[PDB]
Amino acid sequence: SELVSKLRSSIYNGISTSGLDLNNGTIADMRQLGIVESYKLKRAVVSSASEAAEVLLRVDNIIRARPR
Amino acid sequence: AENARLSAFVGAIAVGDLVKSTLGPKGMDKLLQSASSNTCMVTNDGATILKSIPLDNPAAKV
Amino acid sequence: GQIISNINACVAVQEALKPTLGPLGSDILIVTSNQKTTISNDGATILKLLDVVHPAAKTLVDISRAQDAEVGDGTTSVTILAGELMKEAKPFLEEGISSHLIMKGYRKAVSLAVEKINELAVDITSEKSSGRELLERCARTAMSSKLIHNNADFFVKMCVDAVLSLDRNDLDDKLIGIKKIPGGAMEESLFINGVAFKKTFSYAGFEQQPKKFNNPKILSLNVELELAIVDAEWQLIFEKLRQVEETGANIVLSKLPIGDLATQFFADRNIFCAGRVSADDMNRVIQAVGGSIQSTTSDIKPEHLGTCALFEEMQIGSERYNLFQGCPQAKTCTLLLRGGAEQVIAEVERSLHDAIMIVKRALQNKLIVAGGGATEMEVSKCLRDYSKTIAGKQQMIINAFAKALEVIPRQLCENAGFDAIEILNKLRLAHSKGEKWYGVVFETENIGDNFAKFVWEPALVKINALNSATEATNLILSVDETITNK
Amino acid sequence: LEAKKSHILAARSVASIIKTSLGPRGLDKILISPDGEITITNDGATILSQMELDNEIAKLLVQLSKSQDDEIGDGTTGVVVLASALLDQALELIQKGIHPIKIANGFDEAAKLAISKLEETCDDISASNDELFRDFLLRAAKTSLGSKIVSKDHDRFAEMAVEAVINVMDKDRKDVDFDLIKMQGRVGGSISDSKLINGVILDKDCVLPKEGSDGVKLAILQDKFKEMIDDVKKAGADVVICQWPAVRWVGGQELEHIAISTNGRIVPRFQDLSKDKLGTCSRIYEMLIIEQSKETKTVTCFVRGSNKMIVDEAERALHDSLCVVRNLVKDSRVVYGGGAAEVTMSLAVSEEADKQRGIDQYAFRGFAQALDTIPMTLAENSGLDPIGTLSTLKSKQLKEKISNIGVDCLGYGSNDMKELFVVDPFIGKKQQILLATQLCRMILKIDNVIISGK
């Protein structure tokens, strides 16, 4: 609760370099901490999770056929 | 219709609670013990875990 | 006592067919181990696939299988009478009355019944209705008494014209066989004057097949054509192809399929050939084109080759079939069913095959009586007055058979939703003070005259109905014990 | 009557399975094959045909949709919904004491009124030139046939399939060919990698063209290996396909499309090789690509995809368009569906009920109410109130003479089907109504179901 509330208020002021430090349990700079990920890794997990999950979104009932 | 949307959405929730933390050193793990052959695997990623565990949930095929 | 236990198991046979009586009747669904869906009103196909327990159930099956020869239609209003005679006879069997008096008294009632049926049947001939009339106007509702209610108006202007080509004293049932064509409409079925069969196999030149022939000639050959060894096997098949061309046959029917060598030789010369010819289709050509079947090429001669007027390649239902027209001798007109539903094709298949039986018996003798179940009412009315003076106890015995015929109007009211008592009171005065011909009318939902209704039924159906129900009911009473080993 | 009451309730449960799949917007449901494989497709005819239930009443609807798949192939959900709607009204009229045939007689008479009313709404698209006519065929698949996602713009691989049947069919606007039009799939790449050529591409195993010949001299068929080459040198064929350049383990049926397009023949044995079987092929180059630049009716669309269901669902949508285009070319009667003709034909039957009165007034009302189930089902699938949707359609069709106003599933704005280019075959809606009522008459005749002993 408190850690996410401080992180949500940090980006609310226009600071995109903040983050969640699990070692010290506080808000720290991700660039100085050493946490960096590629943009292609971001687009791959976000776009695939939204499109692949559409199978169970539009299908509210599943019917299985008996073994032949 | 009531349990149709429930059992389908919880297919990844039941065995996926341990792999949610996979990113980061604090990630929880899962132990898969075979009934024979004296084999097993320990990993925090659900890739090998899902493929090596047969499930009757139709949503697991997706 | 042992017969009573056997009757109760046989009562449910016609009680499942209970609603099926009349043109408003229903159908029975049967699913076998092969998952073959069969929906039909005729009880012959029902009793054939019906699981039997006691041997008395097979008695009704043997009569139903023999019903096609005696009558062939109206099986719903016939077989049900065999169970009704034994239903009301239960109080008599419990008393000191022996089953022999029931069997002996039954023949005395049928002898009086058939005498009245022949009296009801009247043949005027003279200037009254003739061919193309009796088979149309009076046979409008007579051909199909159960199914094809909405499509009846279509077949009267079609199916009647097909059976008109059948002359009396011949009555060939081998050439009336139909085919199953998926897709299309019922009223759009084309009339076929010759042998037509399915290809059952696809060709690479299927689209390149010749469209039509001016003077085709059909030849039936059983020679199998299939390919130093290479030159020998290819030459022997080539020599057989040249000997066939010497006869000048534009159409060659082969029992076994042919390879590419026989196909390419016939395609360049524009010679038609068809493989996988069934043995039943060969006998159909012999009675139409008049050819012959040659096993080998030793005895083949030019005079064995028949001919027909013209050939045509018909494309229907996204598939092409062989069509013959203008055969030298054709006693009937081939009909091809259509529609997308397989059950509907099999539904009218049993109905059209039952309609030809009327044309068969009409050509021998032309007779019509009042239909709609009014035949048994006039017979039952006459048996009540005669049986009083006939051989003692036979009064109550015949009266039981007289009341057994009352099930027919009770069944017609069950489907139409009428009252069983109300129809008996109106017919009792209609068959006594109203003379005879007044029947029941389903359209106006009241009692009226079948003479002005135009609905008649052949009296020959009721004649064989009592004879078919004679040995059927007598066998139940003549068997007092049933033994099943293991 | 109690036996058929449970059959109608069981038939309504079957229609509720595909109820959400009705229309192009209709959502599918996950189907599990008995072998464990999952089947995900937006085609209503594919899921219903592969699904097998217990009661025989559901199996009777399978045979009804089986004929719809081989004829129409797209939109078979409305066949079961219309058939179930006639049975839903049977719980009332039959309970009132009226015989089913009396109700069935009103359906056949009302069907002729719907066909006659649907014929007046026919709009001929062949009256214009070939530029606007061929454009309507491509735009016909742009909206009505579009179902699955990513289909928003499908015209990349669709125009190849639309123009495929155009070059095969003659300009007299009457043709049918089911022999040479087939779909050939490939697992890999993307759906955008498809190509349109004249020929066939197989999975089994270049030369410059010549002057007189059409090039490559295609002929369909160590001492013995060189001896057969000398026979090829007599005809001069550059590329020769040897079944029994050379290929290994090729099928006979796969080579049929090559011999027909190139006017060649199958050579049973090397002794029968002749020059008369020499064909013409424009170019052959590598998986060899067979192309023909001459006039022929053989056209095969090579399709690629990352999964089997992606290629299978794409082909079934393009293969079913053959019957759609044929009804837009060979058949000059073209009508606008999607809530337009369904509501229009329902208003004509409703007026006939008050004219005849008697027992046919309630019988004709059941037929008009059955046709109103399609827009109410599409309203729930589109997120619109069924009562408010039909109240808007009927209000505009009575006040205005335009009969093309219909249900809008995807939010196209104006409900006019003429501006949205939503077309349905005229013979399609005719066969769906007749064959559905054809089965409903047999359902009402069911008394006792006989099943063989297990």
Swiss-Prot record, chain B:
* Localization, UniProt: Cytoplasm
Tell me the protein family, please: Belongs to the TCP-1 chaperonin family.
Question: What does the record give as the function of this protein?
Answer: Molecular chaperone; assists the folding of proteins upon ATP hydrolysis. Known to play a role, in vitro, in the folding of actin and tubulin. In yeast may play a role in mitotic spindle formation.
What does the record note on quaternary structure?
Heterooligomeric complex of about 850 to 900 kDa that forms two stacked rings, 12 to 16 nm in diameter. Interacts with PLP2; this interaction leads to inhibition of CCT complex mediated actin folding.
Q: What is this protein called?
A: T-complex protein 1 subunit beta
The record lists the organism as Saccharomyces cerevisiae (strain ATCC 204508 / S288c) (Baker's yeast)
From Swiss-Prot, chain C:
**GO CC list:** chaperonin-containing T-complex; cytoplasm
- Matches recorded under InterPro entries: Chap_CCT_eta, Chaperone_TCP-1, Chaperonin_TCP-1_CS, Cpn60/GroEL/TCP-1, GroEL-like_apical_dom_sf, GROEL-like_equatorial_sf, TCP-1-like_intermed_sf, TCP-1_chaperonin
Q: Which domain of life is it from?
A: Eukaryota
Pfam name, any one: Cpn60_TCP1
Annotated GO molecular function terms are: ATP binding; ATP hydrolysis activity; ATP-dependent protein folding chaperone; unfolded protein binding
Record key words, sorted: ATP-binding, Chaperone, Cytoplasm, Nucleotide-binding
Q: Which GO terms describe its biological process?
A: chaperone mediated protein folding independent of cofactor; protein folding
Query: Subunit arrangement?
Result: Heterooligomeric complex of about 850 to 900 kDa that forms two stacked rings, 12 to 16 nm in diameter.
* Family recorded in the similarity comment: Belongs to the TCP-1 chaperonin family.
What is the official name of this protein in its record?
A: T-complex protein 1 subunit eta
Please give the organism. Answer: Saccharomyces cerevisiae (strain ATCC 204508 / S288c) (Baker's yeast)
Which gene is annotated as encoding this protein in its UniProt record?
CCT7
Swiss-Prot record, chain D:
Per UniProt, what is one GO molecular function of this protein? ATP binding
GO cellular-component term (any):
chaperonin-containing T-complex
Q: Where is the signal peptide?
A: none
**Is-annotated flag, keyword Glycoprotein?**
no
For this protein, the record's SUPFAM superfamilies field holds:
GroEL apical domain-like, GroEL equatorial domain-like, GroEL-intermediate domain like
Keyword Cell membrane: yes or no? no
Where does the source fall among the domains of life?
Eukaryota
- Which Gene3D superfamilies does the record match to this protein? GroEL, GroEL-like equatorial domain, TCP-1-like chaperonin intermediate domain
Q: Which key words tag this protein in UniProt?
A: ATP-binding, Chaperone, Cytoplasm, Nucleotide-binding
Give the subcellular location.
Cytoplasm
User: Which spans of this chain does the record mark as coiled coil?
Assistant: none
List the GO biological process terms.
Answer: chaperone mediated protein folding independent of cofactor; protein folding
What Pfam families is this protein classified in? Cpn60_TCP1 (PF00118)
The cross-references to NCBIfam families, in alphabetical order and at most eight, read: chap_CCT_epsi, thermosome_alpha, thermosome_beta
The record describes its quaternary structure and partners as: Heterooligomeric complex of about 850 to 900 kDa that forms two stacked rings, 12 to 16 nm in diameter.
Q: Which family does it belong to?
A: Belongs to the TCP-1 chaperonin family.
Its biological purpose: Molecular chaperone; assists the folding of proteins upon ATP hydrolysis. Known to play a role, in vitro, in the folding of actin and tubulin. In yeast may play a role in mitotic spindle formation.
Q: What is this protein called?
A: T-complex protein 1 subunit epsilon
Q: From which lineage does this chain's organism come?
A: Eukaryota, Fungi, Dikarya, Ascomycota, Saccharomycotina
Q: Which gene specifies this protein's sequence?
A: CCT5
